[PDB]
């Protein structure tokens, strides 16, 4: 991996931004990109989860605050618990990183590449950049919430 | 054999090394125990100073085991350590050359002097943590 500017994460602001040089060989970069995609997706979904949960809840989860302290409610804890089991099923099973052909490539279960998208470098970069922005954000939303008790709306 | 990280004392007496595979397993266990012990020393040091959010009530010392927040923290730490040790983590050790996880963070060199320093510092940390824990459980 002598050059990586052609990888999806290059982006115009800072091409191949890596002052510390943690990943510079193909194997390290593949591992770090798998981790980055996982973190970004988890963040994209955490952020939307906050936003929706504030103004929406499932039956039986009405009492849950829907914010940072959502885990306090026993029903919300049972729900987080069932979500944990489902995420384990996805991780050790369908979306296992080891079985993945490429970092973050889990086979495109729903053919978004066939419809309203493609497995192009442009869309890979879009996913990566959105994951970064969602990451930085969830941290902000959750932390700001802790410092000043407020919900996602901010 | 017996020519890898043996300073100031050469080979330890009554060594259990046996064959090459046995020595490999023993070195893996030794480096793992050292690294844990070094980590535990640092954790006790930092706990004596600062606490996690929502963790101020629990004792800074051993007492965190049977306290409510400390109990959950310890259980989740154990679960995460299991995730890391079963191999699910992407940075996994080479079956040969134990104690080498591929250098997750590109800190730098892997010289014999560095390996000896790591092993010996873990050796100290072993006694440090064991003595600290024994002293706490004994005195109070």
């Amino acid at each position: 991996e002598f050059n990586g500017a052609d990888m999806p994460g290059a982006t115009a602001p800072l091409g191949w931004f890596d002052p510390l040089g943690l990943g510079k060989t193909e194997e390290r970069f593949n591992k770090m990109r798998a981790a980055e995609l996982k973190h970004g997706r988890v963040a994209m979904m955490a952020s939307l989860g906050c936003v929706v949960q504030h103004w929406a809840k499932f039956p039986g989860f009405e009492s849950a605050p829907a914010g940072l302290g959502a885990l306090s409610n026993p029903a919300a804890l049972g729900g987080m618990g069932a979500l944990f089991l489902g995420c384990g099923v996805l991780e050790l099973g369908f979306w296992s990183d080891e079985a993945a052909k490429e970092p973050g490539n889990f086979g495109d279960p729903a053919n978004f590449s066939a419809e309203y998208g493609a497995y192009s470098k442009e869309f890979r970069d879009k996913e990566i950049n959105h994951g970064r922005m969602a990451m930085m954000a969830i941290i902000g939303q959750l932390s700001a919430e802790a410092v000043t008790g407020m919900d996602a709306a901010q | 054999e017996a020519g890898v990280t043996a300073p100031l004392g050469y080979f330890d007496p009554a060594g259990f090394v046996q064959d090459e595979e046995s020595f490999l397993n023993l070195r893996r266990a030794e480096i793992k125990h050292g690294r844990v012990a070094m980590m535990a020393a640092l954790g006790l040091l930092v706990q004596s100073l600062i606490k996690l959010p929502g963790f101020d009530s629990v004792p800074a010392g051993l007492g965190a085991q049977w306290t409510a927040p400390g109990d959950a923290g310890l259980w989740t730490v154990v679960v995460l350590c299991g995730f890391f040790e079963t191999g699910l983590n992407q940075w996994r050790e080479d079956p040969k050359q134990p104690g080498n996880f591929g250098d997750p963070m590109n800190l730098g060199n892997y010289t014999m002097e560095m390996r000896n320093k790591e092993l010996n510092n873990g050796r100290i940390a072993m006694f440090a943590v064991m003595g600290i824990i024994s002293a706490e459980i004994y005195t109070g």
């Binding site: 991780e91 099973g93 990183d97 080891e98 079985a99 | 079963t86 191999g87 699910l88 996994r92």
Partner: peptide, 25 residues
């Protein structure tokens, strides 16, 4: 798979033909 891994292939995973090994042990 590998020549060693083939010694048990066909007797694992949800379907028998899979080889479930997320840890790569």
């Amino acid at each position: 798979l590998t020549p060693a891994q083939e010694s048990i292939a066909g007797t694992g995973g949800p379907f028998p033909e899979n080889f479930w090994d997320p840890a790569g042990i």
